[PDB]
Design a protein around this ligand. Structure first.
Ligand SMILES: Nc1ncnc2c1ncn2[C@@H]1O[C@H](COP(=O)(O)OP(=O)(O)OP(=O)(O)O)[C@@H](O)[C@H]1O
Ligand SMILES: [Mg+2]
Lengths: 49, 57, 114, 29, 232, 221, 117, 50, 100, 114
């Protein structure tokens, strides 16, 4: 029971850390996608010009 | 009486432990799935914003 | 999708998909019977019959073909109704309720009259 | 016309071998 | 004309594909049903053995073993499929059932229907013959619960309520893969089969009486399993 | 001489020897077949003349199989000689898988009663069919095609739902291009999918799987 | 050692050897250990069976209206339907034990008895 | 060609004569316009061999 | 301005005078009917065409909905109603009362 | 039977029968699996696999690719070899032994090489 309580707390902490890393990578990917699509939009606007 | 108490509570503690390993697994999986879903939603919102900005430009 | 929008395009392509599957199944149904189709295909057939009948409409110029006056269905209402059909929200209504109605309000009224 | 139809329908005459066994395991009854 | 022919050649191709798929699925389900038929053999053999022992120790006056003095009605359990495409399966079963009815009338007995499977219900309803009770939706995958219910109703009718003085079961015996034959078996009253040559608790009279309905139930279950195999 | 009219034309489309500069002219004649009658006169003539045929069918188009090439009936007599080594090795099993799927399609309703291998083939084929679908005016570079067909033939789509395959591919490439372009650069510069590049691609596919949200709400891993 | 086999009507359910078998027949409680004289009996509608498996722990089975046979070769338990103690749904058995239907109530009570109440 | 189906199943090698054959409104002009569009990456290289 | 497509198959089935309701049509339509006939038989042709389509569809269905079975019954009774022997003309009033 | 010897015709017809039975069983093998066949069917499937693989040959045209001279199997040798195959005399060798080999000598040598 003590081991299970400790491991449950550890699993919740690991889930928090994994969520933090996942959302950081998600923000990074959002920035990457936004940059790529803004570059595409700029290229298309320059082509139209 | 206490002999009984211990036997039964030991039973329930091995129960708690067997249920708590599953609960920790399921809660970690739920938190991870929620984080991944939010990441996917953020990426989808980024793609939608990219579509909006390209269309408007 | 670039002109009519993604929603309109998706609904139109799903309707066409259902109707093509129904056309492919009509050969089987006429001989082996509907009862021998897959559950998914049976549901699709029930969808497709209603979609075919809902594509029917009481046009103004055809008042002397049907007696009843004509109807006009906004594009948004058409897209919404066909999205509901293709997705299932009307599988409980009888198929004859979808015949010569032209719109969701008319669908409800004719279903109640049935 | 509806009343006539109903009163007419009131009077209208519609035209409408193996055998399962228990083996007793003894030779005689 | 050419358009009609090409459309027909399309339909025929789709029908060929569907029928080949059904043939192979039927080949699989034949194996499944035959495996089930074999799986129920141990219980049937052991219950038959203990039934023979009890009959040897019993008085043999149970109602299911003595003919009624004057048989008026004779129940008939016709076991038919619940879905089509099974060839002459249902036709053969119902032809044998009608032959059995004619034989019963020649013996003065009035047949009364109990029907398993949707198709036999249609056949008998078209001919204005009343089914007292009918069970449907398990001819493909019979369980022991369905057999228990069927045997319980049949035995209750036999003991009785207008009741019946005899009861037969018509079903397609699965003699071999190539061959399946519609057969009629009298499931009650059972003939005592003396043949050339243990302890019982409670005494063998009560135990035998409580066992015989179980024997009828297991035989009906075997009949349903074999009918399912023959249907496949 | 109508046949000659077309032949005299299509036979200009040739690859010249190195003595003549090595230039080539590729022909893509387009023929409209009435009521899918490929046995008509002009269709027969040009099928005889040409080196291969992409047969597009309206039934496949309405099923959503657009670009609607009827694989199987469609053929290219040049064959693998016209493919880069990466596509040749990756897409080698694709044709057999699609043929098996078309054979098994009649069994879609009885997947419980089929053999494990047959059910796996059916599931693989549905996802390959979804994989070959493609939006209009959006051609894919050969490296992206190699990675996409690698997803399906090697079984990395076997966990993705069918209705999401189109998205799973589209996002995955969008990920690889943006973050793991080394795979695309390797395929383009070397024309083959090297073992280290293949391992990197598998690792990135698995990493992406965790962050992918299936439309039905389920997880794909 | 006993050759104990439990045969459901649908299928053979268990075939492991055992050292001792235990059950409540309609005429009282009974236990069987090897070389028991041949016997036939009816298990009570809410009966349970304990099989003292030699190697591992004992096996507790909820049995539905079964029959018991003892023979020089094997001990057979014919069963309409049975469940091992590990497969019993305790809540479902508790709910069924209060059922009005005689068969369902007896089956639920048998499940409870086999489980360990 | 840029079409996964064609490039995987019925590859077109330069020097070949591939027929896009099918009934009306089936996607032929789409296939050929996609093929033409797919050559932009090759064009931007500046290498006549590509 | 219209067709009365008489079918041999329908003629043999006892549907006389053999009008294939689906193919047959009159594009003058209700304008060539008296108001009583127009009101009584406004959708009769389309109802019969739908009945024929459903009869083809429901040839072997064993789970027809209540509405479907009602439609088949109404269509069969209408088909019997439209049967008519040769040289037995009906006045327009009798026709409207019949279709009523 | 007249142009070719009666033995030739008999062996060819036996091979055709075996291959046709195998082609029929292909559907069951692909859908239901090999284990769903009977023992006689499995024996025939093995024999048919070996026969159809023995119909392959190391062609002379392949000498340019592998180096192994092409085999010119005499007609009598082919007849007797396929008589042996159809009678099961070689059903215990692995299937890979029958690929691309002309005659019984090559069959034995390849079997010993596996
Ligand atoms: N891969 C595709 N995905 C979605 N829509 C497509 C695709 N290919 C073609 N379409 C659409 O299908 C329709 C037919 O396309 P297209 O004009 O290329 O046809 P075509 O075979 O050349 O016929 P036509 O004889 O009219 O020239 C157009 O709406 C096109 O947008
Ligand atoms: Mg075009």
């Amino acid at each position: 029971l003590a081991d299970a309580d400790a491991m449950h707390a550890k699993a919740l902490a690991d889930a928090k850390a994994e969520s933090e890393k996942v959302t950081e990578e998600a923000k990074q990917d959002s920035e990457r996608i936004a940059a790529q699509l803004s570059e595409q939009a700029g290229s298309e606007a320059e082509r139209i010009k | 009486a206490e002999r009984e108490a211990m036997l039964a509570k030991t039973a329930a503690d091995n129960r708690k432990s067997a249920e708590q390993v599953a609960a920790a697994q399921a809660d970690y999986e739920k938190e991870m799935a929620e984080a991944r879903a939010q990441a996917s939603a953020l990426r989808d919102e980024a793609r939608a914003a990219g579509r909006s900005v390209v269309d408007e430009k | 999708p670039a002109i009519v929008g993604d929603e309109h395009y998706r609904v139109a392509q799903e309707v066409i998909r259902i109707l093509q599957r129904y056309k492919d199944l009509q050969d089987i149904i006429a001989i082996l019977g509907i009862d021998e189709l897959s559950e998914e295909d049976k549901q699709l057939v029930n969808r497709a019959r209603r979609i075919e009948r809902f594509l029917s409409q009481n046009m103004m110029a055809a008042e002397q073909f049907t007696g009843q006056p004509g109807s006009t269905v906004p594009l948004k209402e058409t897209i919404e109704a066909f999205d509901k059909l293709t997705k299932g929200e009307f599988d409980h209504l009888p198929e004859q309720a979808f015949f010569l109605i032209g719109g969701l309000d008319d669908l409800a009224k004719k279903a109640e009259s049935l | 016309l509806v009343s006539v139809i109903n009163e007419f329908k009131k009077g209208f005459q519609a035209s409408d071998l193996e055998k399962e066994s228990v083996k007793v395991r003894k030779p005689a009854p | 004309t050419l358009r009609e022919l090409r459309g027909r050649i399309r339909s025929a191709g789709s029908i060929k594909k569907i029928t080949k798929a059904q043939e192979l699925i039927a080949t699989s389900r034949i194996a499944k049903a035959q495996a089930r038929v074999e799986a129920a053999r141990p219980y049937a053999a052991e219950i038959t053995n203990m039934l023979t022992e009890l009959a040897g120790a019993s008085a043999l006056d149970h109602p299911l073993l003595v003919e009624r003095k004057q048989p008026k009605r004779a129940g008939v359990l016709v076991v038919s499929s619940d879905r089509g495409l099974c060839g002459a399966y249902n036709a053969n079963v119902l032809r044998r059932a009608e032959e059995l009815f004619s034989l019963l009338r020649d013996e003065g007995k009035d047949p009364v229907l109990y029907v398993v499977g949707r198709k036999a219900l249609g056949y008998f309803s078209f001919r204005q013959r009343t089914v007292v009770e009918s069970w449907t939706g398990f001819s493909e995958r019979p369980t022991y619960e369905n057999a228990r219910e069927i045997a319980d109703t049949l035995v209750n009718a036999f003991m009785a309520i207008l009741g019946v003085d005899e009861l037969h079961i018509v079903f397609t015996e699965f003699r071999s893969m190539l061959s399946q034959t519609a057969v009629a078996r009298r499931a009650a009253p059972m003939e005592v089969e003396y043949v050339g040559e243990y302890s019982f608790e409670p005494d063998p009279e009560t135990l035998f009486d409580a066992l015989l309905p179980r024997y009828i139930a297991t035989r009906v279950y075997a009949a349903l399993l074999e009918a399912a195999a023959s249907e496949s | 001489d109508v046949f000659y009219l077309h032949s005299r034309l299509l036979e200009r489309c040739a690859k010249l020897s190195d003595e003549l500069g090595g230039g080539s002219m590729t022909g893509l004649p387009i023929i409209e077949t009435k009521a899918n009658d490929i046995s008509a006169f002009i269709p027969t003539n040009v099928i005889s003349i040409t080196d291969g045929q992409c047969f597009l069918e309206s039934d496949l188009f309405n099923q959503g199989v657009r670009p609607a090439i009827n694989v199987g009936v469609s053929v290219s007599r040049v064959g693998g000689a016209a493919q880069i080594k990466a596509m040749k090795e990756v897409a080698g099993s694709l044709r057999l898988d699609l043929s098996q799927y078309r054979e098994l399609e009649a069994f879609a309703a009885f997947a419980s009663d089929l053999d494990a291998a047959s059910k796996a083939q059916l599931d693989r084929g549905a996802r390959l069919v979804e994989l070959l679908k493609q939006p209009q005016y959006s051609p894919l570079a050969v490296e992206e095609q190699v990675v996409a067909i690698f997803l399906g033939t090697q079984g990395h789509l076997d966990s993705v739902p069918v209705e999401d395959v189109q998205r799973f591919e589209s996002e995955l490439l969008e990920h690889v291009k943006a973050s793991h372009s080394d795979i695309f650069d390797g395929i383009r510069e070397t024309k083959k999918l090297s073992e280290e590049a293949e391992e990197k691609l598998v690792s990135v596919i698995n990493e992406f799987k965790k962050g992918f949200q299936a439309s039905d709400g389920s997880s794909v891993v | 050692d006993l050759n104990v086999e439990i045969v459901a009507v649908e299928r053979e359910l268990w075939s492991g050897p055992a050292t001792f078998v235990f059950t409540r027949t309609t005429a009282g409680e009974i236990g069987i250990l090897p070389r028991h004289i041949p016997l036939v009996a009816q298990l009570v509608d809410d009966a349970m069976v304990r099989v003292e498996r030699e190697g591992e722990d004992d096996l507790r089975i909820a049995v539905d209206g079964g029959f018991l046979s003892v023979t020089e070769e094997t001990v057979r338990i014919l069963v309409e339907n049975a469940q091992f103690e590990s497969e019993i749904d305790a809540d479902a058995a508790k709910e069924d034990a209060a059922s009005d239907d005689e068969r369902t109530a007896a089956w639920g009570r048998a499940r409870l008895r086999a489980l360990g109440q | 060609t840029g079409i996964k189906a064609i490039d995987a199943m019925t590859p077109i090698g330069r020097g070949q004569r591939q027929l896009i054959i099918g009934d009306r409104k089936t996607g032929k002009t789409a296939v050929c316009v996609d093929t033409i569009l797919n050559q932009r990456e090759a064009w931007l290289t500046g290498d006549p061999k590509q």
